[PDB]
Amino acid sequence: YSIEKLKKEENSLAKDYYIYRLLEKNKISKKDAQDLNSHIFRYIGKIKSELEKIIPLKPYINPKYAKCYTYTANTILDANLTCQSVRLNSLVFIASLNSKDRTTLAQTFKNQRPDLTNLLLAFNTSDPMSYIVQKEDINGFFKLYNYSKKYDLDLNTSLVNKLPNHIGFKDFAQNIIIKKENPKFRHSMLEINPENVSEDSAFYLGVNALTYDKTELAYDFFKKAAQSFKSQSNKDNAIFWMWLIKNNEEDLKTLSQSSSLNIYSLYAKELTNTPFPKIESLNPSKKKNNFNMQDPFAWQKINKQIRDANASQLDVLAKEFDTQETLPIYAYILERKNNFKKHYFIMPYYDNIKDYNKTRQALILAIARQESRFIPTAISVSYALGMMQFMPFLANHIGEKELKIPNFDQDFMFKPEIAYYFGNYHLNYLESRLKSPLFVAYAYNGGIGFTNRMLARNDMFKTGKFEPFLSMELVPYQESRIYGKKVLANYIVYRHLLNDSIKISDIFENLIQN
Numbered sequence: 245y246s247i248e249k250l251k252k253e254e255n256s257l258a259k260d261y262y263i264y265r266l267l268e269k270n271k272i273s274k275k276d277a278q279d280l281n282s283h284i285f286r287y288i289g290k291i292k293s294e295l296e297k298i299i300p301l302k303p304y305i306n307p308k309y310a311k312c313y314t315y316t317a318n319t320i321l322d323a324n325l326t327c328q329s330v331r332l333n334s335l336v337f338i339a340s341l342n343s344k345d346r347t348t349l350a351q352t353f354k355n356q357r358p359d360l361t362n363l364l365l366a367f368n369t370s371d372p373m374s375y376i377v378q379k380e381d382i383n384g385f386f387k388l389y390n391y392s393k394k395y396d397l398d399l400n401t402s403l404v405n406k407l408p409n410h411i412g413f414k415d416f417a418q419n420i421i422i423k424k425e426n427p428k429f430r431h432s433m434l435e436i437n438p439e440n441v442s443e444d445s446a447f448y449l450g451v452n453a454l455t456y457d458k459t460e461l462a463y464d465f466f467k468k469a470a471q472s473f474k475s476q477s478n479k480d481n482a483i484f485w486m487w488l489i490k491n492n493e494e495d496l497k498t499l500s501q502s503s504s505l506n507i508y509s510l511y512a513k514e515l516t517n518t519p520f521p522k523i524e525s526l527n528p529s530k531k532k533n534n535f536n537m538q539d540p541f542a543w544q545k546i547n548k549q550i551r552d553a554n555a556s557q558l559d560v561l562a563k564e565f566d567t568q569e570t571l572p573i574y575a576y577i578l579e580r581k582n583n584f585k586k587h588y589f590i591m592p593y594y595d596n597i598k599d600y601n602k603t604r605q606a607l608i609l610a611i612a613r614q615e616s617r618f619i620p621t622a623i624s625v626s627y628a629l630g631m632m633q634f635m636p637f638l639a640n641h642i643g644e645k646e647l648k649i650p651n652f653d654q655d656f657m658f659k660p661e662i663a664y665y666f667g668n669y670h671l672n673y674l675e676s677r678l679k680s681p682l683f684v685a686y687a688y689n690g691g692i693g694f695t696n697r698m699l700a701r702n703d704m705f706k707t708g709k710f711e712p713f714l715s716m717e718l719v720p721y722q723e724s725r726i727y728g729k730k731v732l733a734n735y736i737v738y739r740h741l742l743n744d745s746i747k748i749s750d751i752f753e754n755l756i757q758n
């Protein structure tokens with residue numbers, strides 16, 4: 245489709261994908277690209293940097309403060325007082341000034357903006373973080389952390405307990421704990437009162453406390469996380485820790501009776517001889533309908549209707565799409581429609597995988613459920629394609645160089661036959677090197693480079709009191725940490741449905757290297 249037909253379609257990730265594809269093939273003229281900013285659902289990342297190679301946009305700065313960016317560190321004392329304050333938002337700017345000008349600007353600002361005063365005087369020292377910490381300036385602490393992550397220093401109880409009141413705190417704690425940077429910051433965060441944190445912050449501080457073997461503080465942190473978490477999956481992750489640390493059976497019972505199906509609730513059910521949860525069964529009699537499951541545009545359309553529906557338009561959609569041909573959509577609508585209380589694990593386009601061994605089938609289906617919910621024409625924000633969410637680099641390399649498919653286009657990933665076959669091929673490569681389906685899941689999402697780098701560390705997936713569950717919490721990419729846990733649960737479930745059950749404790753045992 246030409247840029248002109250693309251312009252007639254609604255903004256969406258599909259449209260973006262296709263505009264990107266013209267860009268990468270250099271088929272968009274400077275003229276085509278004029279009105280094109282209005283035609284991009286999500287102007288971030290690749291399509292942005294690619295369209296800015298044609299029409300650079302170097303904006304934007306408000307007409308108000310335009311005079312203010314005509315001054316440099318050399319001429320800043322000639323600037324009016326508003327301009328002075330604007331430029332001092334940048335800690336790099338402040339670092340650029342000489343110390344005489346910092347002293348002067350610091351006196352100007354001590355009345356109305358002592359935040360500025362403190363940063364100004366801080367950069368007149370060999371250690372700005374220490375100066376800020378001594379003044380207990382919370383806003384300054386975070387501006388310094390964002391400016392430079394290499395500042396590290398011990399923080400007292402008074403101070404650490406103020407940090408969680410700032411929006412930066414969560415990202416700050418997550419980062420330094422899973423990356424294992426700022427050891428003095430980490431050690432100091434052992435004195436945060438659990439009362440003062442909640443949710444993810446509380447959870448990550450529980451993980452922190454485990455790493456220093458402070459199991460009491462860890463429980464309190466995990467407990468506070470259990471009581472505050474919005475989603476049940478996260479509550480469960482926290483209840484599981486509560487149990488592992490103390491071993492109260494009230495905790496494990498709550499976890500075995502969870503409405504959320506996840507690895508922690510599954511493991512707990514196994515440990516308590518609780519029966520496997522009820523998996524729905526969808527077998528629509530209706531054979532097909534009008535809907536083109538191979539049209540990416542139709543999907544994005546119907547996907548917006550499903551998202552933006554009262555739980556009553558849903559029942560109109562559910563019935564419209566209650567067919568064998570639109571089964572993946574049916575299950576998608578149903579999942580939302582029953583408020584995520586029912587467990588849907590379909591096996592669509594099964595003829596394409598029925599001749600693989602059942603353990604392989606489970607792995608493929610588990611990946612596809614998380615990647616796509618089995619939507620053939622699914623496109624991610626990084627433009628990963630189809631049910632198995634292949635990046636176009638990898639899809640083209642497999643399809644052109646390896647499997648030598650004739651007339652291979654990357655849009656072939658929209659075909660179930662192909663998605664499942666390339667999925668099988670790529671998983672074969674990963675399994676043969678990594679073995680565990682959890683490790684395979686990490687590498688399917690984050691690449692095998694990152695996974696091998698992680699497994700080579702001697703603090704990851706080794707033996708230890710709290711292993712392998714602690715390592716699972718310390719996987720360094722957030723997206724991959726979450727992905728693994730989910731795909732693993734999907735794997736258990738699908739092995740079960742396939743009559744190829746495995747104890748999840750068996751999976752956890754083979755995560756440890758001896």
Ligand SMILES: CC(=O)N[C@H]1[C@H](O[C@H]2[C@H]3C[C@H]4[C@@H]2OC(=O)[C@H]4C3)O[C@H](CO)[C@@H](O)[C@@H]1O
Pocket residue numbers: 613614615616617622623624625628633689723727
């Ligand atoms: C289409 C899409 O955005 N897919 C992405 C996937 O997101 C799914 C999840 C979260 C949403 C999204 O599409 C769905 O149907 C739900 C299941 O997440 C993965 C990382 O975990 C991504 O690797 C994958 O590309």
